[PDB]
Design a protein around this ligand. Structure first.
Ligand SMILES: O=C1CCCN1c1cccc(NS(=O)(=O)c2cccc(F)c2)c1
Length: 127
């Protein structure tokens, strides 16, 4: 029932870069999803205490949220686009694992994921 430390967003000895694809993931992908009417449950780590989800972090062992992704992008935490793409996919998958079909939160994730997929389809080639 207690909350874990959030995923890290800073790690000085981790290798990191700026790439044009990572710039796109911030300026286009993250910004598109962040402004969406259904973004709010995903804009910070799941607070299992406030939301009364005592089993959440017993089930979800790789938590991820857009708050974390946003900070990672702003802090240039990533080495490549695939790392960031994986974080988004982890976020969506967690939602589908924990919840059941047709739940409001799943409909919300599905809407965000559709947009995500549309934007990642237009990911620029590197350099
Ligand atoms: O699985 C995840 C990923 C992010 C949040 N989340 C989740 C899952 C179950 C319940 C709740 N609690 S809630 O108040 O934020 C809530 C309730 C009903 C609908 C809705 F959209 C939002 C949140």
């Amino acid at each position: 029932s207690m909350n874990p430390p959030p995923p890290e967003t800073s790690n000085p000895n981790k290798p990191k870069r700026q790439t044009n694809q990572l710039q796109y993931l911030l300026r286009v992908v993250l910004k598109t999803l962040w402004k969406h009417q259904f973004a709010w449950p995903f804009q910070q780590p799941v607070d299992a205490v406030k939301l009364n989800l005592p089993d959440y972090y017993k089930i979800i062992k790789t938590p991820m949220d857009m708050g974390t992704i946003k900070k990672r992008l702003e802090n240039n935490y990533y080495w490549n686009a695939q790392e960031c793409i994986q974080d988004f996919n982890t976020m969506f998958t967690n939602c589908y694992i924990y919840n059941k079909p047709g739940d409001d939160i799943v409909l919300m994730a599905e809407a965000l994921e559709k947009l995500f997929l549309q934007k990642i389809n237009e990911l620029p080639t590197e350099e």
